[PDB]
Design an enzyme around this catalytic site. Structure first.
Site, PDB file in Angstrom:
ATOM      1  N   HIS A  60       0.841  -1.227   0.000  1.00 32.28           N
ATOM      2  CA  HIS A  60       0.000   0.000   0.000  1.00 32.28           C
ATOM      3  C   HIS A  60       0.870   1.268   0.000  1.00 32.28           C
ATOM      4  CE1 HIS A  60       0.167  -1.558   4.096  1.00 32.28           C
ATOM      5  NE2 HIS A  60       0.664  -0.363   4.426  1.00 32.28           N
ATOM      6  N   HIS A  90       7.113   6.777   5.591  1.00 33.67           N
ATOM      7  CA  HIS A  90       6.406   6.409   4.324  1.00 33.67           C
ATOM      8  C   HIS A  90       5.691   7.647   3.824  1.00 33.67           C
ATOM      9  CE1 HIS A  90       3.366   5.658   7.337  1.00 33.67           C
ATOM     10  NE2 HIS A  90       2.541   6.242   6.434  1.00 33.67           N
ATOM     11  N   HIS A  92       2.304   9.107   1.158  1.00 32.32           N
ATOM     12  CA  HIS A  92       0.996   8.966   0.548  1.00 32.32           C
ATOM     13  C   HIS A  92       1.101   9.894  -0.682  1.00 32.32           C
ATOM     14  CE1 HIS A  92      -0.898   6.828   3.771  1.00 32.32           C
ATOM     15  NE2 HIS A  92      -0.137   7.560   4.590  1.00 32.32           N
ATOM     16  N   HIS A 115       5.102  10.934   6.318  1.00 28.09           N
ATOM     17  CA  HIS A 115       4.772  10.592   7.701  1.00 28.09           C
ATOM     18  C   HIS A 115       5.993   9.936   8.325  1.00 28.09           C
ATOM     19  CE1 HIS A 115       0.190  10.336   6.657  1.00 28.09           C
ATOM     20  NE2 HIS A 115       0.589  11.640   6.780  1.00 28.09           N
ATOM     21  N   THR A 195      -3.953   4.372   8.296  1.00 33.36           N
ATOM     22  CA  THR A 195      -4.338   3.125   7.636  1.00 33.36           C
ATOM     23  C   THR A 195      -4.782   2.138   8.727  1.00 33.36           C
ATOM     24  OG1 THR A 195      -2.338   1.957   7.824  1.00 33.36           O
ATOM     25  CG2 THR A 195      -2.477   3.300   5.808  1.00 33.36           C
TER      26      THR A 195
HETATM   27 ZN   LIG Z   1       0.716   7.530   6.530  1.00 31.03          ZN
END
Ligand SMILES: [Zn+2]
Length: 255
Positions: A60, A90, A92, A115, A195
């Protein structure tokens, strides 16, 4: 769970009821409504001793993991009490420059969001920390498209090595400091994991100042795959959750 039409965020509540809870994330930050809190101390980012170990495609997103067995890369101060250790980072991102960030500012969407995940050392490990209301601290960094970010290129060049789900690559000597904006001014609010399991254990720290990256650098993100090697190709794009209800919570500003 994923980000498609059949498993997207509008479906997450069926397996994770907490999805419609009281302190969900991300949220729209209304700058005219955010309260300037003079009692807010400056953020304290100590990452000179950071030890990166590797990078992986978890289907993801991609995570850059760090050795959290000693107070090497730590966050303190701000709205926090105690020491939070960096465990991973990570991003997005979107299919176009007009979308991709999780948090929004006066409804404006950034091209991506960074993040930096940290866990409170009083709880002894990450898995215990997620069970606590003050268990995690996440540093959110918005990305705008303009000039290249030199400190991000090392991340971009290895994406080829981890194109599909389950691939990972050794990734040592990466310094997170190259990803920080010049200012440490931020907004903060109690929220959740962005998430699944979407646990409501995070103290969000969103920085006001965006870092800029080149079109070419974000392009390389859009080339990742949600699928495993040997499955139809599903590009990894729009892996972001829509803004959730603030429901009473208040957003404080350090400026
Ligand atoms: Zn995140």
């Amino acid at each position: 769970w994923g980000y498609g039409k059949h498993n997207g965020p509008e479906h997450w509540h069926k397996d994770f009821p907490i999805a419609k809870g009281e302190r969900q994330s991300p949220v729209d930050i209304d700058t005219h409504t955010a309260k300037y809190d003079p009692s807010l101390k400056p953020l304290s980012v100590s990452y000179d001793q950071a030890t990166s170990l590797r990078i992986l495609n978890n289907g993801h997103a991609f995570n850059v993991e760090f050795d959290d067995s000693q107070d090497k890369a730590v966050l303190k101060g701000g709205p926090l009490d105690g020491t939070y250790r960096l465990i991973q980072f990570h991003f997005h991102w979107g299919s176009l420059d007009g979308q991709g960030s999780e948090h929004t500012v006066d409804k404006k969407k950034y091209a991506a969001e960074l993040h930096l995940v940290h866990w409170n050392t009083k709880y002894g490990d990450f898995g215990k920390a997620v069970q606590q209301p003050d268990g995690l601290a996440v540093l959110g960094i918005f990305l705008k498209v303009g000039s290249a970010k030199p400190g991000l290129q090392k991340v971009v060049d290895v994406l080829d090595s981890i194109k599909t789900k389950g691939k990972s690559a050794d990734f040592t000597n990466f310094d997170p400091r190259g990803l920080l904006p010049e200012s440490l001014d931020y907004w903060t609010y109690p929220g959740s994991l962005c998430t699944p399991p979407l646990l409501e254990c995070v103290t969000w720290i969103v920085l006001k100042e965006p870092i800029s990256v080149s079109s070419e650098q974000v392009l390389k993100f859009r080339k990742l795959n949600f699928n495993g090697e040997g499955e139809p190709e599903e590009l990894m794009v729009d892996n972001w959750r829509p803004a959730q209800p603030l429901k009473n919570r208040q957003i404080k500003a350090s400026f």
